[PDB]
Design an enzyme around this catalytic site. Structure first.
Site, PDB file in Angstrom:
ATOM      1  N   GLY A   1       0.813  -1.214   0.000  1.00  0.00           N
ATOM      2  CA  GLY A   1       0.000   0.000   0.000  1.00  0.00           C
ATOM      3  C   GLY A   1       0.842   1.257   0.000  1.00  0.00           C
ATOM      4  O   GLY A   1       1.963   1.253  -0.528  1.00  0.00           O
ATOM      5  N   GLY A   2       0.323   2.314   0.632  1.00  0.00           N
ATOM      6  CA  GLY A   2       1.013   3.598   0.764  1.00  0.00           C
ATOM      7  C   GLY A   2       2.413   3.483   1.340  1.00  0.00           C
ATOM      8  O   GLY A   2       3.310   4.248   0.964  1.00  0.00           O
ATOM      9  N   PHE A   3       2.614   2.471   2.203  1.00  0.00           N
ATOM     10  CA  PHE A   3       3.871   2.147   2.882  1.00  0.00           C
ATOM     11  C   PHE A   3       4.944   1.417   2.037  1.00  0.00           C
ATOM     12  O   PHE A   3       6.122   1.430   2.414  1.00  0.00           O
ATOM     13  CB  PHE A   3       3.560   1.322   4.141  1.00  0.00           C
ATOM     14  N   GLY A   4       4.527   0.749   0.960  1.00  0.00           N
ATOM     15  CA  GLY A   4       5.412  -0.041   0.109  1.00  0.00           C
ATOM     16  C   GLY A   4       4.946  -1.486   0.029  1.00  0.00           C
ATOM     17  O   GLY A   4       3.739  -1.740   0.050  1.00  0.00           O
ATOM     18  N   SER A   5       5.896  -2.445  -0.068  1.00  0.00           N
ATOM     19  CA  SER A   5       5.615  -3.887  -0.145  1.00  0.00           C
ATOM     20  C   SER A   5       6.365  -4.629   0.945  1.00  0.00           C
ATOM     21  O   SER A   5       7.576  -4.428   1.111  1.00  0.00           O
ATOM     22  CB  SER A   5       6.013  -4.439  -1.505  1.00  0.00           C
TER      23      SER A   5
ATOM     24  N   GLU B   1      11.200  -7.047  12.762  1.00  0.00           N
ATOM     25  CA  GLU B   1      10.808  -8.234  13.496  1.00  0.00           C
ATOM     26  C   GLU B   1       9.410  -8.686  13.065  1.00  0.00           C
ATOM     27  O   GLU B   1       8.625  -7.883  12.561  1.00  0.00           O
ATOM     28  CB  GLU B   1      10.952  -8.026  15.014  1.00  0.00           C
TER      29      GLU B   1
ATOM     30  N   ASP C   1       0.277   8.569  12.694  1.00  0.00           N
ATOM     31  CA  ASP C   1      -0.691   7.717  12.000  1.00  0.00           C
ATOM     32  C   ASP C   1      -1.159   6.570  12.902  1.00  0.00           C
ATOM     33  O   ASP C   1      -1.251   5.412  12.483  1.00  0.00           O
ATOM     34  CB  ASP C   1      -0.177   7.249  10.613  1.00  0.00           C
TER      35      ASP C   1
HETATM   36  C1  LIG Z   1       2.875  -9.155   9.447  1.00  0.00           C
HETATM   37  O1  LIG Z   1       4.055  -8.639  10.064  1.00  0.00           O
HETATM   38  C2  LIG Z   1       4.428  -7.342   9.796  1.00  0.00           C
HETATM   39  C3  LIG Z   1       5.583  -6.985  10.475  1.00  0.00           C
HETATM   40  C4  LIG Z   1       6.063  -5.693  10.380  1.00  0.00           C
HETATM   41  C5  LIG Z   1       5.420  -4.743   9.593  1.00  0.00           C
HETATM   42  C6  LIG Z   1       5.902  -3.348   9.574  1.00  0.00           C
HETATM   43  C7  LIG Z   1       6.668  -2.653  10.486  1.00  0.00           C
HETATM   44  C8  LIG Z   1       6.785  -1.370   9.997  1.00  0.00           C
HETATM   45  N1  LIG Z   1       7.407  -0.309  10.528  1.00  0.00           N
HETATM   46  N2  LIG Z   1       6.140  -1.243   8.823  1.00  0.00           N
HETATM   47  N3  LIG Z   1       5.603  -2.476   8.590  1.00  0.00           N
HETATM   48  C9  LIG Z   1       4.278  -5.122   8.890  1.00  0.00           C
HETATM   49  C10 LIG Z   1       3.780  -6.410   8.988  1.00  0.00           C
END
Ligand SMILES: COc1ccc(-c2cc(N)[nH]n2)cc1
Length: 273
Positions: free
Chosen positions: A15-19, A89, A135
């Protein structure tokens, strides 16, 4: 390098965050999440104590990534020609709070109290580390189902915490305060308390209170579910129209609704197992 150090599993989300991909660290079989962010999509840049040009997200994650398990920890990062790769993690089994509420509906107040308390402790950790998340919402909270522990994720819209006015915002509009909607100005801590009021209403009602800008500005809270008077009082307090009328983190945690919180393990035993 990175390609040999990690075994890439399936795509978890995008999404907005990437993959983000599921992964395993080859050295000790540790579960990890591998997040890719395209360089052309990074607007906020910062620099580490050394001075390397990295996304703000990497700066903020390093400032908060220490012993406390309330924030997801950054294990490593890599720079590629057109992207940055973040090793995070990964709890297992896990479920985000949005999916949890969608599946189970409005939460019992004992469960919402435990969850809300843990989010408050995580936000206080961020602020103590000089980090403003910007957020806070159900989608950005992971539940470690075995331990009953919550973790804040996605520092991609965050900023360094300051005492002066913010005039930029790229978080979720429906969680944004009336001062942002009206004046395009807010202070970090009081804007965080507003988003916490939206989140608590979401936990106990199963949905967010406002959809339109007009509703945010009016700030009239209607309860669609049976919610205790103490919980309703706390929500209405966090959702005060005037930023100066909102409670501090101390006032929230000393509220009568916040007393006798369950420990995370007790929470998993009663509500998650
Ligand atoms: C399903 O497990 C995850 C683990 C970590 C993330 C994550 C952490 C950050 N800062 N952005 N996304 C998303 C999903």
């Amino acid at each position: 390098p990175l390609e040999s150090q990690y075994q890439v599993g399936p795509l978890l989300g995008s999404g907005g965050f990437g993959s983000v991909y599921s992964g395993i660290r080859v050295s000790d079989n540790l579960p990890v999440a591998i997040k890719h962010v395209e360089k052309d999509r990074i607007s906020d840049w910062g620099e580490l104590p050394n001075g390397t040009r990295v996304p703000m997200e990497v700066v903020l994650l390093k400032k908060v990534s220490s012993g406390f398990s309330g924030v997801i920890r950054l294990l490593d990062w890599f720079e590629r020609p057109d992207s940055f790769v973040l090793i995070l993690e990964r709890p297992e089994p896990v479920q985000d709070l949005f999916d949890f509420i969608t599946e189970r509906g409005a939460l019992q107040e004992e469960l919402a109290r435990s969850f809300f308390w843990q989010v408050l402790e995580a936000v206080r950790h961020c602020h103590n580390c000089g980090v403003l998340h910007r957020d806070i919402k159900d989608e950005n909270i992971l539940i470690d189902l075995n331990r009953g522990e919550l973790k804040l994720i996605d520092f991609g819209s965050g900023a360094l915490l300051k005492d002066t006015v913010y005039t930029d915002f790229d978080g979720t509009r429906v969680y944004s305060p009336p001062e942002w909607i009206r004046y395009h100005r807010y202070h970090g801590r009081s804007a965080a308390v507003w988003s916490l009021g939206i989140l608590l209403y979401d936990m106990v009602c199963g949905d967010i209170p406002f959809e339109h800008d007009e509703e945010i500005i009016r700030g009239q809270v209607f309860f669609r579910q049976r919610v205790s008077s103490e919980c309703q009082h706390l929500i209405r307090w966090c959702l005060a129209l005037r930023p100066s009328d909102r409670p501090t983190f101390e006032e929230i945690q000393n509220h009568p609704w916040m007393q006798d919180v369950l420990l995370p393990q007790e929470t998993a035993e009663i509500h998650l197992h």
